[PDB]
A = this chain, B = another copy of it.
Amino acid sequence: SDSRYTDLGLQPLAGEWRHGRAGRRLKVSNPFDGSLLLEIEQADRDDLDAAYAKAAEVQPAWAALGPSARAAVLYKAVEVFDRRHEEIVDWIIRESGSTRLKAEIEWGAARAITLESASFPARVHGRIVESDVPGKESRVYRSAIGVVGVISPWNFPLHLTQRSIAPALALGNAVVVKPASDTPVCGGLLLARIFEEAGLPAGLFSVVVGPGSEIGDAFVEHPVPGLVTFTGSTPVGRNIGRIASGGAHLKHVALELGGNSPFVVLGDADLEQAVSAAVFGKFLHQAINRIIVEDSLYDAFAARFVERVKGLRVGDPQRADTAVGPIVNARQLEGLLEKIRLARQEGAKPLYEGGVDGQLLAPHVFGEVTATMEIARDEIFGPLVGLLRARDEAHALELANASEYGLSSAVFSRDLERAVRFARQLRAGMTHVNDIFNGDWAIEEFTTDHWISVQHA
């Protein structure tokens, strides 16, 4: 509406906006200057029990509504997204240290997910199945799961939270969100305000703000949520997976784990395009952690890549021209610095070191990386990339599949037939070729089938 959202420290629990009863206060501050953005009263485990319980009670009435009723809320949320565009973008930059450019991408991503979700309630349908038994009719009913528990990473909190929240709500579920302690308003707390403006009924969307462990395990172990979704690093996902499966209550778990993702430049690839795609993939629009180039193109690629990375300007994330911004928190920045010293100890040739200034970590580029080295093996959420030499195309394929855990991939070759043949051999789920979600996915994920066979005359 008119003025910016206020009292954001208040968290939405069990249909009311209130303080948490922990008696411990979380401080949320800007990574660039350290200035305090707000303070939050943290939530108890009993605060968690009220949010899950209210979600289970209010959800059936929500799902009972017509698809137009539920679609109306999602459509209204898009209006708020347009009205509060700068205020949303400003919050991402200040809380996440995100560049103004990346923040704008995230805003469009979350907006796009919301518009696509408004279409989902009309699309979902059940099935009638033929039966051999006389007088028997088989009916399969598609229904909402119930309560969905969503855990948000610090990495791209607004978009990744919305990627689960918007389809789950549209399909008639209730959501309880645990955001990252560094980015509580960006994940869930701001989105909760937006859905209230959209008219989502109270109790359907609750955000619980608490410490990562102690409350984190209680979040996964709870009996109420039918599905728990997490996107983030592999060590956290591995623990979340064991809690969901190991615990007395077994809950369906959806785990999207970041992995080292290969960017492959074959010999015929156009050099400039490959260099530009690498620069924008690693340092501007986020999925690239390793660059593998055939030997014929390696030295030229490394030279031009390193020169152009030198041009990238580290600075205040609020500026549109800024390409690299501050790391979100100290623990993440320290982990990156530990990787940089490790990369030197491994024996990587250091092509460019830009230094660390406070939270700002300038790009660090390494060459002569091998598959065994840690920089190639493990996921990096920072401006640190290693360059690998490939003897031939087959060797490049061996190196690319070596990372094993990868979300996305890229292949660059002048021959599209060869590139696709290479791309299909990759172990990754995504591959982009010579670069310059699904409704069906969401519908299966956030709904369950019930088979009902009826015998009459």
Q: A residues touching B (Cβ–Cβ < 8 Å)?
A: 133, 136, 139, 141, 143, 234, 237-238, 240-242, 244-246, 250, 253, 255, 257, 405, 416, 419-420, 423-424, 426, 428-436, 448-456
Contacts and interface: CB of A to CB of B under 8 A. Distances in A.
Given A241-B245, A244-B245, A431 B452 contact: yes
The winner among A237, A420, A434 for most chain B CB atoms within 10 A is A434
**Identical chains in the assembly:** 2
Contacts of A456: 416, 434
A426 B451 CA distance: 11
A136 B432 CA distance: 10
Chain A contact surface mostly: mixed
Contacts of A423: 450, 452
Nearest to A136: B435
Counting from the closest, the 4 A-B pairs by CB-CB distance are A241-B245, A242-B246, A434-B455, A433-B454
B453 A432 contact: yes
Contacts of A452: 420, 423-424, 430-433
A431 B420 CA distance: 46
A255 B449 CA distance: 16
Contacts of A431: 450-453
B434 A450 contact: no
Contact of A424 (B238, B430, B450, B455): B450
B453 A433 contact: yes
Contact of A430 (B250, B426, B451, B455): B451
Which has the most chain B C-beta neighbours within 10 Å: A136, A454, A456?
A454
A241 B238 CA distance: 12
Contacts of A240: 245
A280 to B, nearest CB: 14
Contacts of A448: 429
Contacts of A136: 435
Contacts of A424: 141, 143, 450, 452
25 contacts: A133-B435, A139-B420, A237-B250, A241-B244, A242-B245, A242-B246, A245-B245, A245-B246, A246-B246, A250-B257, A416-B454, A416-B456, A423-B450, A429-B449, A430-B451, A430-B452, A431-B450, A431-B453, A432-B453, A432-B455, A433-B452, A433-B453, A433-B455, A434-B454, A434-B455
A240 B245 CA distance: 8
A448 B430 CA distance: 11
A276 to B, nearest CB: 12
Nearest to A440: B127
Contact of A242 (B242, B419, B450): B242
